[PDB]
Amino acid sequence: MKLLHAIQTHAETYPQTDAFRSQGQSLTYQELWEQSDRAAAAIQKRISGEKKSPILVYGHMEPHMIVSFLGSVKAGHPYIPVDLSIPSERIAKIIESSGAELLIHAAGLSIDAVGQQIQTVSAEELLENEGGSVSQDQWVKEHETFYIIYTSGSTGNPKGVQISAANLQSFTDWICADFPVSGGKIFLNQAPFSFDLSVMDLYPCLQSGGTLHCVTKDAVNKPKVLFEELKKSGLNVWTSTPSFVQMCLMDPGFSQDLLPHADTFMFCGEVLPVSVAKALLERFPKAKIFNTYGPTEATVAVTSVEITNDVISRSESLPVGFAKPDMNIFIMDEEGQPLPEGEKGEIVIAGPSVSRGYLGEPELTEKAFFSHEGQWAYRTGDAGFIQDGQIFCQGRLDFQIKLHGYRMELEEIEFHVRQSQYVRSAVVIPYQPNGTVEYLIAAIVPEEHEFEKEFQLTSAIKKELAASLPAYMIPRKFIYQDHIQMTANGKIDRKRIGEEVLVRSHHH
C-alpha cells in the first residue's frame, strides 16, 4: 500500500488518533491529511507544475514540517528538508543546485531570519488556502522523486540524493513488515528531518498509523527536560544514532524505568558500539535491539540484525545485518569484481532502495552509481566482508567520516577552510584514537594577515565557516604551521601531520 494511501486511510478510519507530537503541539491523522491537502493546493498556485522542481521545507520539528512534506508530494513536487542548523550559505548552495522555486518556513521567521533568493512562504500563510484539495493523480508516484536529502560533498558543495516514491515505499514496507513496529505504536524522533535517519521512524510510523513523538534540539540541550519529555512520551519505538542513546545511557536514570513502554530499539547511521548494546540489554529487558546499516544514497538502511547477547559474544564487532530481503549486496574489489565470504572489499548495494543519483551532478553520480546485472547499484565507499551471510562493516576507503553520527567529508571542510583569504593551505585531522572520531583538528598554513593574538586569526576563520558549514563540521582545534607535507608528488601525508599535531597537543 503506497504510503500516502495508508495515511489517507488512517485519516478516515481513526481521524482522532494522534499522528504527530512535538513540544506540546499535536496533530491527528485527520488534521495532517486535511492540512497537507490544503497545502498541496496552495502550492500549485505558487509554482509551475511544468517541471517537478524541489520545494525546500525549512524549520526543525514543528507540525508544519510534516504537513509541508506531504503537501509538497501531494502537489507532485519532492521536498528538500532543511533544518534550522543549516547555515545561510549552505542553504543558498542547496537552493542554487536544486532549482527549487519555493521555500516554506514552518513558521513566521524572526529578527533577520529568512534572507534567500527564492519564493518564501510561511506554513501558516499557505494553510489559509481554501477548498484546497488536490487529487491522487497529482501525488508523486513510482520513480518520481519524493524527497531530496542533501549531504556533504567532498568537492566543497553539498550533493542532493534523490529518493523516489518507490525507493521510500520499498524501505517503508520493509520496516513495517520485518520489524516489531506495527500496531500503531509511539515512535520517537530525535534526528532532524534533514538527515534520512529520521525517515526510519517518520514514514514507517505514519504508514503503520502510529504516533510520532519528537524530541527537539531544545530538549536535548537540557538533560533534565530531555528525560522529563521522554518519560511522559510513553514511546514504544526508539530510533536514533548510537551516539544519541549513548549520551542518554550516560545517566543511570535512563533504563526500563524511565521508558516503561519502550520495546524496540532501531539504530542506524554509525557503528553501534558493543558496549552500548550490552547496556541496553541490561537496562531495557523488555525491548529488542536492531542494528541496520546503509548510506543515504540507498534510502536509510539496507540491512538489519537483532542484537542479542548471543550475537554479542559471537563477535567483538557487531555485524550490520543481513540484506534487505529484496536488496543485493556484494563485496566488490579494487578491480571492480565480486569477492567470496571472508575477503575484505567495498560494500556494494544493488536494488530498489538505490537512488537514481545526485541532483544536477551527473559526473558525481556516474562515479558512484552503476548498472550491475541489470539493477541500479551504488559503491558505498565502505570496506567490509560477509561472514555467515551477514555483512560486517569496517572503516571507509575514502576521506568521509562520522563524528558523533554526523556524516561529513574531510575534503569539503578543507575546501572551505582553504577558501578563506587568511588561509593558504589546510588539512583537517580527525582525532580518532580508538576508531570513533571525537573531534577534528585543522592544521593551517596561514596567509600573512594583520591580526594580534591567535584566537584572532582562528576566530575570523571559524566565523566564516559558521556561514557555510553546519556547526558539527567546524573543526574544534586550529593549529598553524609553515607548510604541508605533500606526498605522492603532491598528495599530502595526512598520517604524519596528525602525529605532529598530537605531539604539539602535549606542549602547552
Site residues (vs ligand AMP, CB under 6 A): 151, 268-272, 291-296, 320, 380, 382, 393, 396, 402, 407
| Spacing of C-alpha 487 from chain mean position | 34
Closer to ligand AMP by CB, 33 or 392: give it.
Answer: 392
End-to-end CA distance of the chain: 62
Which residue ranges make up the annotated binding site for D-alanine?
A: 196, 300, 491
Closer to ligand AMP by CB, 172 or 425: give it.
Answer: 172
Q: Which helix (H) or strand (E) holds 176?
A: helix 165-178
CB of 295 to ligand AMP, least distance (A): 4
Contact (CB, 8 A) for 137 and 45 = no
> 222-225: long-range contacts (C-beta < 8 A, 24 or more apart)?
223/251
CB of 292 to ligand AMP, least distance (A): 6
**404 contact partners, CB below 8 Å, separation of at least 6:** 241, 243, 472
Contact (CB, 8 A) for 32 and 7 = yes
Which residue ranges make up the annotated binding site for ATP?
A: 151-152, 291-296, 382, 407, 491
CB of 202 to ligand AMP, least distance (A): 15
Tell me how far apart the alpha carbons of residues 27 and 145 are, in angstroms, rounded to a whole number: 26
Closer to ligand AMP by CB, 297 or 464: give it.
Answer: 297
Which residue ranges make up the annotated binding site?
A: 151-152, 196, 291-296, 300, 382, 407, 491
Closer to ligand AMP by CB, 208 or 296: give it.
Answer: 296
Closer to ligand AMP by CB, 342 or 395: give it.
Answer: 395
Closer to ligand AMP by CB, 19 or 181: give it.
Answer: 181
CB of 223 to ligand AMP, least distance (A): 25
Tell me how far apart the alpha carbons of residues 66 and 212 are, in angstroms, rounded to a whole number: 10
CB of 337 to ligand AMP, least distance (A): 21
Closer to ligand AMP by CB, 57 or 289: give it.
Answer: 289
CB of 186 to ligand AMP, least distance (A): 24
**For the stretch 257-292, what's the b/e string if a residue is b when 16 or more beta carbons lie within 10 angstroms of its beta carbon?**
ebbeebbbbbbbbbbbbbebbebbbebbeebbbbbb
CB of 272 to ligand AMP, least distance (A): 6
Closer to ligand AMP by CB, 438 or 499: give it.
Answer: 438
How do strand 159-164 and strand 477-480 relate by DSSP bridges? unpaired
In DSSP notation, 183-231 reads TT-EEEE-S-TTSTHHHHHHHHHHHTT-EEEE--HHHHT-HHHHHHHHH
CB atoms near residue 218 (< 10 Å): 13
In DSSP notation, 363-420 reads HHHHHHEEEETTEEEEEEEEEEEEETTEEEEEEESSSEEEETTEEEEHHHHHHHHHTS
Name which of 165, 236, 171 is nearest 204 in CA terms.
171
CB of 243 to ligand AMP, least distance (A): 12
